[PDB]
């Protein structure tokens, strides 16, 4: 709809600082800083490789729209996320204890808090036993 189109247009002009019809990497740096996190140069450049398609060095409005338009069903990330779960599927059966989810998720890399990881459990472990069958979660959301 045009509402979300103009909504991403406002997101474009909020990303935009100097007003060159595109979003440079420095705008990405200063908006990530605007939330509190201080990223590295190569990080923002990698983000550009995620968004841009013509290879200019910035983020235009079409590529930003395309990045915001697609959902998990439009990603082909089923095998990707199942492999990522498999690396933390230690025994290889398909199950991990909820406390182990909290421990790993909240202490590895881009960690989160307890309410968020518990939300992951309540959304992944459907019947609610703490023993999560990751395939039900990835075939629910990712697909």
């Amino acid at each position: 709809t045009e509402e979300q189109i103009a909504e991403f247009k406002e997101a474009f002009s909020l990303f935009d600082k100097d007003g060159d019809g595109t979003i440079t990497t420095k705008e990405l740096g200063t908006v990530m800083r605007s939330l509190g996190q201080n990223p590295t140069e190569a990080e923002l450049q990698d983000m550009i490789n995620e968004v841009d398609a013509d290879g200019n060095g910035t983020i235009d409005f079409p590529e930003f729209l395309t990045m915001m338009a697609r959902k998990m069903k439009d990603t082909d990330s089923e095998e990707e996320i199942r492999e990522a779960f498999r690396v933390f599927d230690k025994d290889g059966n398909g199950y991990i204890s909820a406390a182990e989810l909290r421990h790993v998720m909240t202490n590895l890399g881009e960690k989160l808090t307890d309410e968020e990881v518990d939300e992951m459990i309540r959304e992944a472990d459907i019947d609610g036993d703490g023993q999560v069958n990751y395939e039900e979660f990835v075939q629910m959301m990712t697909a």
């Binding site: 909020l14 995620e50 915001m68 990603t75 990522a84 998720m105 808090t113 968020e116």
Partner: protein
């Protein structure tokens, strides 16, 4: 017992579909069942034992079609653990899966055979025998290692083929007169193919001194060139599973994996698919329009997470030491140059 309901459905889908341990015992028992059906059908075509053959064939065929029927139906029932097959439309697309169509096909077909069709019976048994694979992984592994070793296999067969022609032609020349075995060049080629493969029937053996002398020289070369691809593919599988073992123990991709799920939940929690999402939303309004701002930057973070996961998805055994030593020593170069520069800044004071 709806939780126990889903637990039993889970266990069924676990054993019936992708197995882990002792489930190979169930598959072994159905393997022996269908295999004994095959063997008995083979015994059926023999004229004398036909009576006992059919006398057990009817009964055991009913047993195995009942087993196949319940297996198929409970597989449809157990497909609930998978989300893509849930309810009418999901389970019916699971019925649209080609393998399951072949399965229900042979079920109704055999029942129709019971409702000169014996040749069709043995054909259907070969079909249901191939059915046991369910994956095609056998042909995939074979094609992988063949395509890898393609040039060496072609070399072995090509040079062996020339050795076959040359040796068989010379023998034919030396053994046309005083032997009724080699009457044409075709029978000579039959001899060459039978000996160089080390089969050795014994119907055609050289019975001269020129022929035996020539064969005695070209046999050490023939039998060595026609038994190369077996050894080549053998050592190929050995080395491949050996490096797959090594790479299986050195995953080391747990960090990008946890990052994948991390920013994946960041995206879903920031996605507008649900309104009750506030925990992660609050987690970003505390660590400080704004919705789509954090959303867009989060989608970028999830895309770099997905691509970083894709990169670290392929760590090898030799590529580990090679790439990490190139990286390690280049970082070391930055270390030594930073050392000299900063200690010169100590000298600069």
């Amino acid at each position: 017992r709806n939780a126990f309901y889903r637990k039993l459905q889970n266990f069924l889908y676990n054993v019936l579909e992708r197995p882990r341990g002792w489930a190979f015992i169930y598959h072994a028992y159905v393997f022996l069942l269908v295999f004994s059906c095959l063997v008995l059908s083979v015994f059926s075509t023999i004229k004398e034992y036909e009576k006992s053959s059919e006398g057990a064939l009817y009964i055991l065929e009913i047993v195995t079609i009942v087993v196949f029927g319940v297996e198929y139906f409970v597989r449809i029932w157990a497909a609930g653990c998978c989300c893509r097959y849930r309810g009418w439309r999901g389970r019916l697309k699971f019925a649209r899966k080609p393998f399951c169509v072949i399965d229900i096909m042979v079920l109704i077909a055999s029942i129709a055979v019971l409702a000169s069709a014996l040749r069709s019976l043995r054909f259907l048994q070969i079909l249901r025998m191939i059915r046991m694979d369910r994956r095609g992984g056998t042909w995939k592994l074979l094609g992988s290692v063949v395509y890898a070793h393609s040039k060496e296999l072609v070399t072995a067969w090509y040079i062996g083929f020339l050795c076959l022609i040359l040796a068989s032609f010379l023998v034919y020349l030396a053994e046309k007169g005083e032997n009724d075995h080699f009457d044409t060049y075709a029978d000579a080629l039959w001899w060459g193919l039978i000996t160089l493969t080390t089969i050795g029937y014994g119907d055609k053996y050289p019975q001269t001194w020129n022929g035996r002398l020539l064969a005695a020289t070209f046999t050490l070369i023939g039998v060595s060139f026609f038994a190369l691809p077996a050894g080549i593919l053998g050592s190929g599988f050995a080395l491949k599973v050996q490096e797959q073992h090594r790479q299986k123990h050195f995953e080391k991709r747990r960090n990008p994996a946890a990052g994948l799920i991390q920013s994946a939940w960041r995206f879903y929690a920031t996605n507008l698919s649900r309104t009750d999402l506030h925990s992660t939303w609050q987690y970003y309004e505390r660590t400080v329009g704004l919705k789509v701002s954090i959303r867009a930057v989060c989608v970028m973070r999830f895309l770099v997470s997905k691509r970083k996961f894709k990169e670290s998805l392929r760590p090898y055994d030799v590529m580990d030491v090679i790439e990490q030593y190139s990286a390690g020593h280049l970082d070391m170069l930055s270390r030594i140059k930073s050392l000299q520069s900063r200690v010169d800044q100590i000298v600069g004071r």
